[PDB]
Design an enzyme around this catalytic site. Sequence first.
Site, PDB file in Angstrom:
ATOM      1  N   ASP A   1      -0.722  -2.591   7.160  1.00  0.00           N
ATOM      2  CA  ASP A   1       0.516  -1.206   6.563  1.00  0.00           C
ATOM      3  C   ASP A   1      -0.341  -0.679   5.210  1.00  0.00           C
ATOM      4  O   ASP A   1       0.365  -1.162   4.565  1.00  0.00           O
ATOM      5  CB  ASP A   1       1.484  -2.072   6.831  1.00  0.00           C
ATOM      6  CG  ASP A   1       2.974  -0.928   6.576  1.00  0.00           C
ATOM      7  OD1 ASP A   1       2.648  -0.041   6.285  1.00  0.00           O
ATOM      8  OD2 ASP A   1       3.615  -1.099   7.289  1.00  0.00           O
ATOM      9  N   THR A   2      -0.918   0.526   5.277  1.00  0.00           N
ATOM     10  CA  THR A   2      -1.340   0.892   3.540  1.00  0.00           C
ATOM     11  C   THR A   2      -0.140   1.425   3.110  1.00  0.00           C
ATOM     12  O   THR A   2       0.460   1.643   2.036  1.00  0.00           O
ATOM     13  CB  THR A   2      -2.249   2.185   4.173  1.00  0.00           C
ATOM     14  OG1 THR A   2      -1.369   3.435   4.809  1.00  0.00           O
ATOM     15  CG2 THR A   2      -3.547   1.854   4.493  1.00  0.00           C
ATOM     16  N   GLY A   3       0.785   1.416   3.902  1.00  0.00           N
ATOM     17  CA  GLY A   3       2.354   2.190   2.845  1.00  0.00           C
ATOM     18  C   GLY A   3       2.895   0.877   2.262  1.00  0.00           C
ATOM     19  O   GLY A   3       4.615   1.623   2.278  1.00  0.00           O
TER      20      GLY A   3
END
Lengths: 99, 99
Positions: free
Chosen positions: B25-27
């Site tokens: 999850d890059t966020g």
Amino acid sequence: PQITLWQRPLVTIKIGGQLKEALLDTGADDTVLEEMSLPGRWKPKMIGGIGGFIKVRQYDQIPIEICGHKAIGTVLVGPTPTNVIGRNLLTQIGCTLNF
Amino acid sequence: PQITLWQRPLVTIKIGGQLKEALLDTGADDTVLEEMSLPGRWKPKMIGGIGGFIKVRQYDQIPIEICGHKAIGTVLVGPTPTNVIGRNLLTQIGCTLNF
Ligand SMILES: COC(=O)N[C@H](C(=O)NN(CCC[C@@]1(O)Cc2ccc(cc2)C/C=C\CNC(=O)[C@H](C(C)C)NC1=O)Cc1ccc(-c2cccnc2)cc1)C(C)(C)C
Ligand SMILES: [Cl-]
Ligand SMILES: [Cl-]
Ligand SMILES: [Cl-]
């Protein structure tokens, strides 16, 4: 571009002729933006995040530029903590994860 | 590897002697996993996402392996609906977004 993750992957998007900042979020199925106006009719959707569920307005077939890359797709509008670009649009702009 | 975003980017992680599936999850600022035991000291933390906040336990300097890539970092544990690998560990395995 190649974007490393030492900072939040915040990019400029353009939607409805306005610039906004948004987060490139591979953990999100959908794209959800803070309250704004969009054209046409909307449908209901309930989306779940780590804190629980929120109701949003679903708009389809909306043009949106992401880091200068053109996409046209579904944009949800509701009480999100930040603008998030999810996989529905990340795929349109050819994004992958690499390591 | 190069990981497509047509589907959710789920991988196997090894942590605390356990195998678990988790979402890259890059966020996400932080890595958060469903309830499990970890060794050593912890302190409480509130973390926020869509839907609001949850209370988690913060464990530091935890060894983890993600797709055969070893790293060490802070792991949060609590009532997250789903296991998330966040940027604090994605950096360590050299994960980037590319388009
Ligand atoms: C398929 O559902 C989704 O894709 N949900 C997404 C979603 O919440 N996905 N998550 C990944 C986490 C999203 C986000 O990066 C989204 C996000 C939210 C706030 C911020 C950045 C990014 C900024 C504010 C504070 C920093 N908070 C975080 O960095 C947190 C992390 C601590 C976890 N980051 C996030 O919560 C994982 C997630 C997936 C499913 C659920 C879920 C499942 C079943 C029932 N309820 C919820 C919950 C979390 C939506 C954004 C569309 C709601
Ligand atoms: Cl879409
Ligand atoms: Cl860390
Ligand atoms: Cl790097």
